């Protein structure tokens, strides 16, 4: 509480370039001639940058003892997360969200002779599900010295201004953290390999590469909205379609300027060379090669469970403590389209999807499995099927038909493997499914 | 052009500790390594690389 300052100057982080203070003095017909007629220019040059350390009561732990100011101003700003539009409702009670999707069936061939013995045959409706759980619980803690800061300001309005600034800082911290948490979902999705990757050269390397990226984006947007649908753009390999009004594009800030200066300022009827869906501008992604991401509005599966604020008072320390609690569920839906444009060196195969991920068969039953390989290139890859239940008599064929021995009781795992690496150093991409056994 | 230490004025007790962060204003895309030092004048005071 006993603080003494001396031998300190106003040059904390100051790196002066060329010292116009002496340039004005030694100004022999240069551009600094206009400042010669000014009389009291030296003082303005000396203290025109703002002084961090005033000569009376320079700095101290608590600024209540000594005050000499003719005018005090409190700066207050507010920050918001542009992705707030992607948030869903609230979940007061419960923990888990279940999402259900029924797919299309396969066509059979007409056979009257065979139809006379299987009029009561059964055929499962081909349903898939996934679940989402609450995964964020945090709080922001800030303490204020009420009585120690009442004296620090000679005016009441300054004290409420400072308190409001602290509260606004808490809320801005919450907003920034929410923005970062929402942005982390895309990076996690790309890290796990669940995006559909489209290769590009570089959006900003040249105007030709920019036009190529624009063409690829427009073609992808057109493909995502066809009435017949496709199963090549969602991570569950399910036949589905999206809508142009629901497609959103997320890009960086430099690309917008590049585009609107290179093509939009020189092209007639510029609607023919602009972005198609809704465009959102952010400060880039953390992954090495992500340039842009196009997702459906239903791709985000974010909900909030708790938002509250509590205060406690410490009499001995003579201060207040504020805790702001926020609890949220942050997840994504694998049933929606999600394409990422990558300008690096993508692996040959990103993932392998096995259509029945959960199965339940009896001791003499059979099951059929389908493998979809997400390849970023035009090459062809061969899958190999295996079953690692551990009990003899159960086997899976090369086409994906699994047969179970009459006497075995353990949970089986079905594996589809693709080899993309070179010889003596294999690189395997693996898709898995789980099978339960009934007596 | 400059290096900015986020806590510019700090006040600590004898046995206390402080944390400082440095922001470098670079005109290029390179990354520059910072070095931390103390100009107190007596032993028993130290700063780490972070």
**Collapsed DSSP state (helix, strand, coil) of residue A3:** coil
Closest to A213 (Cα-Cα) out of A124, A127, A292: A292
Spatial separation of the C-alpha atoms in residues A30 and A28, rounded to whole Å: 6
Angle at A202 between CA A270 and CA A192, to 5 degrees: 115
- Reported resolution, Å: 3.0
B22 close to A (CB below 8 A): no
**Collapsed DSSP state (helix, strand, coil) of residue A427:** coil
Q: Tokens 């299987």 label which residue?
A: A118
Contact A390, A359 (CB under 8 A): no
Question: How many other CB atoms are there within 10 angstroms of residue A284's CB atom?
Answer: 14
Contact A280, A295 (CB under 8 A): no
Give the minimum alpha-carbon distance from B10 to chain A in angstroms, rounded to a whole number.
Answer: 8
* Residue of chain A minimizing CA distance to B13: A1
A93, burial (CB in 10 Å: exposed 0-12, middle 13-18, buried 19+): exposed
Say whether A60 and B11 touch across the interface (CB within 8 A): yes
Ordered DSSP codes for A319-387: EEEEEEEEEEE--B-TTSBEEEEE-S---SEEEEEES--EEEEETT-EEE--EEEEESSS----EEEEE
Contact A294, A217 (CB under 8 A): yes
Tokens of A49: 């940058």
Partner-chain residue, chosen from A15, A60, A61, that has the shortest CB–CB distance to B2: A15
Closest to A64 (Cα-Cα) out of A161, A154, A189: A154
Question: How many other CB atoms are there within 10 angstroms of residue A416's CB atom?
Answer: 23
> Which residues of chain A lie closer than 8 angstroms to B9, CB-CB?
52-53, 59
Give the minimum alpha-carbon distance from A22 to chain B in angstroms, rounded to a whole number.
Answer: 20
Closest to A279 (Cα-Cα) out of A262, A260, A293: A293
Say whether A12 and B5 touch across the interface (CB within 8 A): yes
Tokens of A147: 């009585």
Tokens of A261: 């200066």
Closest to A194 (Cα-Cα) out of A221, A229, A233: A233
Ordered DSSP codes for A184-253: HHHHHHHHHT-SEEEE-S-TTT-HHHHHHHHHHHHHHHHHHT-TT-BSSSBTT---B---GGGEEEEEEH
Helix (H) or strand (E) holding A212: helix A207-224
Give the minimum alpha-carbon distance from A13 to chain B in angstroms, rounded to a whole number.
Answer: 6
Closest to A305 (Cα-Cα) out of A96, A136, A131, A90: A90
Angle at B31 between CA B25 and CA B37, to 5 degrees: 75
Radius of gyration of chain A (CA): 32
Q: Tokens 């028993």 label which residue?
A: B44
Calculate the CA A340 to chain-centre distance.
12
Spatial separation of the C-alpha atoms in residues A368 and A126, rounded to whole Å: 12
Q: Tokens 């602290």 label which residue?
A: A166
Sequence length of chain B is: 50
Spatial separation of the C-alpha atoms in residues A205 and A216, rounded to whole Å: 16
Contact A366, A403 (CB under 8 A): yes
> Which residues of chain B lie closer than 8 angstroms to A15, CB-CB?
1-2
Phi/psi-derived region of residue A297, left when phi > 0, alpha when psi is between -120 and 50, beta in every other case: alpha
Contact A439, A363 (CB under 8 A): yes
**Collapsed DSSP state (helix, strand, coil) of residue A439:** coil
Calculate the CA A75 to chain-centre distance.
31
Closest to A199 (Cα-Cα) out of A224, A221, A229, A220: A220
Spatial separation of the C-alpha atoms in residues A106 and A125, rounded to whole Å: 10
Tokens of A3: 């603080």
Q: Tokens 């303005």 label which residue?
A: A44
Spatial separation of the C-alpha atoms in residues A129 and A101, rounded to whole Å: 6
Tokens of A78: 């507010």
Tokens of B20: 């400082």
CB within 8 Å of A55: residues ≥ 6 apart: none
Mark out the alpha helices in A118-196 (DSSP H runs).
Answer: 146-150, 156-192
Say whether A61 and B11 touch across the interface (CB within 8 A): yes
Question: Looking at chain A from residue 43 to 102, which residues have their Cβ under 8 Å from any Cβ of chain B?
Answer: 52-53, 59-61
What kind of experiment solved this structure? Answer: cryo-EM
């Amino acid at each position: 509480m006993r603080i003494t300052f001396n031998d300190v100057k106003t040059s904390l982080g100051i790196t002066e370039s060329y010292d116009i203070v002496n340039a004005i003095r030694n100004s022999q017909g240069d551009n600094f001639k206009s400042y010669v007629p000014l009389a009291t220019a030296n003082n303005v040059a000396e203290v025109g940058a703002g002084i961090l350390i005033n000569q009376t009561v320079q700095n101290d732990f608590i600024t209540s003892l000594v005050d000499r100011i003719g005018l005090v101003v409190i700066r207050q700003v507010s920050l918001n997360n542009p992705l707030k539009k992607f948030k869903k409702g609230q979940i007061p009670l419960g923990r888990t969200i279940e999402e259900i999707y029924t797919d299309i069936t396969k066509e059979k061939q007409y056979d009257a002779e065979e139809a006379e013995q299987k009029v009561f045959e059964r055929e499962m409706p081909n349903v898939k599900t996934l679940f989402h759980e609450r995964n964020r619980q945090g709080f922001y803690h800030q303490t204020i010295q009420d009585d120690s800061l009442k004296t620090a300001f000679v005016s009441w309005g300054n004290f409420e201004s400072f308190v409001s600034s602290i509260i606004n800082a808490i809320y801005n911290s919450a907003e920034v953290d929410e923005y970062e948490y929402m942005k982390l979902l895309v990076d996690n999705y790309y890290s796990k390999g669940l995006f559909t990757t489209v290769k590009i050269d570089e959006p900003t390397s040249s105007t030709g590469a920019l036009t190529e990226f624009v063409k690829k984006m427009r073609a992808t947007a057109r493909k995502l909205t066809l009435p017949q649908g496709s199963r090549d753009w969602n991570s569950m390999a399910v036949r589905t379609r999206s809508y142009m009004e629901d497609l959103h594009l997320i890009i960086d800030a430099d690309l917008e300027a590049e585009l609107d200066v290179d093509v939009l300022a020189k092209a007639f009827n510029m609607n023919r060379t602009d972005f198609l869906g809704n465009v959102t501008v952010i400060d880039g992604f953390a992954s090495t090669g992500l340039e842009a991401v196009l997702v459906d509005k239903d791709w985000f599966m974010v909900y909030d469970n708790l938002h509250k604020m509590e205060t406690v008072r410490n009499p001995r320390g003579l201060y207040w403590n504020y805790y702001y609690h926020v609890w949220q569920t942050l997840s994504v839906s694998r049933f929606a389209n999600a394409v990422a444009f990558v300008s690096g060196d993508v692996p040959a195969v990103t993932q392998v999807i096995v259509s029945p991920n959960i199965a339940a068969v009896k001791q003499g039953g059979q099951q059929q499995f389908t493998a979809y390989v997400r390849a970023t290139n035009a090459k062809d890859h061969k899958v190999v099927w295996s079953v690692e239940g551990g009990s003899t008599g159960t086997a899976i064929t090369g086409d994906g038909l699994l047969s179970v021995s009459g006497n075995e009781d353990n949970q089986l795992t079905v594996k589809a493997t693709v080899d993309i690496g070179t010889e003596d150093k294999p690189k395997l991409v693996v898709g898995e499914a789980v099978v339960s056994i009934r007596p």
